[PDB]
Design a protein around this ligand. Structure first.
Ligand SMILES: [Mn+2]
Length: 276
DNA sequence: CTAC
DNA sequence: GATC
DNA sequence: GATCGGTAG
């Protein structure tokens, strides 16, 4: 009895039906993901907005099937300035966004196509793919420089309008957010410095982890599973994909979902419901 | 190979 | 990174 | 931890 995602709750705390649906998903290779029929699932889940991480489509050529999407006509991308088939994000929307900007306004963090900010009417949606510290924590010191700058950026956005941050935030916040908590203290993605940075972002903006708010004690819930050692089969995974919301968006919160059965990548999709 |  |  | 160990560009 490890983990099975509860039925979608399509109503806010006050009783109103969810008016918006945002789906985020790290695909570990866009093309490879489509080949694995990743669209068939998205077209099925038919989100109002689609956010993707690790697109790795730095050939200026995005798949054809993408233009064969009526519900996500308005599409925005952001790839690295100098790195082939690496990182890369994307944001597809049903309705048209008031304004869409890239990066975090910091020249040393805007070089790897990791951030896409989409400003709407009632809020601002930021999808992101956080810089991984790597093996042997080679880039740990840099990640720390990223985190601060990042939360500082978002704090200035929320100050003006409600924020919804979705995406691979690359970090299991508290122990309940991964299988082996004790066996990874020193592994990339669960360092004290990273964990602390996540707590920072949350209390500074401020923001609220959607799922960990609705499901306070639910364990064994994850969004990542290494392809090695058949990890997904044993549910030996991490929860690195979040939907952080401004506090004022909490009464608008209908449900935060984990699409565990959905295939096509080492990560699974997460979906949010908002009654706006 | 490399970063994941 | 999960294992032993 | 010493080892063994999946990946899309
Ligand atoms: Mn990945």
């Amino acid at each position: 009895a490890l983990y099975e995602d509860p039925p979608d709750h399509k109503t806010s705390p006050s009783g109103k039906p969810a008016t918006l649906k945002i789906c985020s998903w790290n695909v570990d290779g866009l093309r490879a993901w489509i080949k694995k029929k990743g669209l068939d699932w998205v077209k099925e889940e038919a989100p109002d907005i689609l956010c993707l991480q690790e697109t790795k489509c730095s050939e200026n050529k995005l798949p054809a099937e993408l233009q064969e999407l009526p519900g996500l006509s308005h599409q925005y991308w952001s790839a690295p300035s100098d790195k082939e088939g690496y990182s890369g994000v994307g944001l597809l929307s049903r309705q048209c966004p008031l304004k869409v900007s890239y990066g975090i306004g910091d020249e040393e963090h805007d070089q790897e196509g990791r951030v896409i900010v989409a400003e709407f009417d009632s809020f601002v949606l930021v999808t992101a793919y956080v810089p991984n510290a790597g093996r042997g924590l080679v880039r740990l010191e840099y990640r720390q420089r990223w985190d601060e700058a990042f939360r500082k950026f978002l704090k200035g956005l929320a100050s003006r309008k409600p924020l919804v941050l979705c995406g691979d935030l690359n970090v299991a916040h508290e122990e309940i957010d991964l299988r082996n908590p004790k066996g990874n203290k020193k592994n990339a993605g669960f360092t004290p410095q990273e964990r602390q940075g996540f707590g920072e972002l949350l209390q500074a903006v401020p923001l609220a982890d959607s799922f960990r708010h609705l499901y306070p004690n639910t364990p064994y819930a994850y969004t990542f599973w290494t392809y090695m050692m058949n990890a997904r089969s044993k549910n030996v995974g991490w929860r690195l994909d979040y939907f952080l919301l401004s506090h004022s968006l909490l009464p608008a919160l209908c449900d935060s979902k984990i699409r565990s059965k959905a295939l096509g990548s080492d990560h699974c999709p997460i979906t949010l419901y908002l009654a706006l």
